[PDB]
Amino acid sequence: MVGLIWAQATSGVIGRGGDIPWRLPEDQAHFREITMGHTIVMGRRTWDSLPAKVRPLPGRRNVVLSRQADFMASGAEVVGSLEEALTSPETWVIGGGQVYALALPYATRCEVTEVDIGLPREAGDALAPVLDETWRGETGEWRFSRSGLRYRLYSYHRS
Ligand SMILES: NC(=O)C1=CN([C@@H]2O[C@H](COP(=O)(O)OP(=O)(O)OC[C@H]3O[C@@H](n4cnc5c(N)ncnc54)[C@H](OP(=O)(O)O)[C@@H]3O)[C@@H](O)[C@H]2O)C=CC1
Numbered sequence: 001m002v003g004l005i006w007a008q009a010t011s012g013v014i015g016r017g018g019d020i021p022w023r024l025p026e027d028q029a030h031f032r033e034i035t036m037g038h039t040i041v042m043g044r045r046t047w048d049s050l051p052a053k054v055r056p057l058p059g060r061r062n063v064v065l066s067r068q069a070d071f072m073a074s075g076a077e078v079v080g081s082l083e084e085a086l087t088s089p090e091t092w093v094i095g096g097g098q099v100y101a102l103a104l105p106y107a108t109r110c111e112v113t114e115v116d117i118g119l120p121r122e123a124g125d126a127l128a129p130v131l132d133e134t135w136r137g138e139t140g141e142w143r144f145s146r147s148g149l150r151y152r153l154y155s156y157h158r159s
């Protein structure tokens, strides 16, 4: 099982300037619960976005994708191809935009948080992948985050 998990603005933006232009504690907790205990695969730029004092993310096999053969990610595995990372029963690809595009053919689940923030797409933004018509989606109700933004969870599946 390879799943993708991301939070997006309604427009599809997931990242800007190498970081994320929101933070919903409830989404962070949802992310932690879904990934805990499993492999998490991230692109090198997403690894770089984590402060050194919080990485590796605890309780998970942290894997970082890079073309740099000597890139060191203390507390993680660095691999040069996505396929090397998919050896555990449950693997979560946790971003960013480039890595979702590479991982989509291997994926059968997407856990998507939609953040009700009006954020038009800009050059250089990281975006959510486009899910075609092979994917079945299930939508939750809109909820209010303590951060002031509404959000809702989608669970997409395919065989
Ligand atoms: N809202 C959300 O849910 C999420 C948001 N984000 C945001 O997304 C942005 C980062 O996403 P993005 O900029 O797309 O970068 P990624 O996190 O996708 O990392 C890109 C890097 O991955 C490596 N890589 C890419 N393609 C390949 C390949 N074919 N083979 C080997 N290595 C490869 C390269 O590393 P190298 O350069 O070392 O070769 C490349 O620089 C940030 O803004 C981050 O905050 C991140 C995760 C989820």
Ligand SMILES: CC1(C)N=C(N)N=C(N)N1c1ccc(Cl)cc1
Binding pocket: 005, 006, 007, 020, 027, 028, 031, 046, 047, 049, 050, 093, 094, 095, 111, 112, 113
């Ligand atoms: C916390 C956040 C934004 N939330 C969701 N739904 N999915 C992710 N992949 N996230 C994420 C987790 C870790 C990192 Cl480093 C970047 C984004």
Ligand SMILES: [Co+2]
Binding pocket: 033, 034, 035, 036, 037, 038
């Ligand atoms: Co689990």
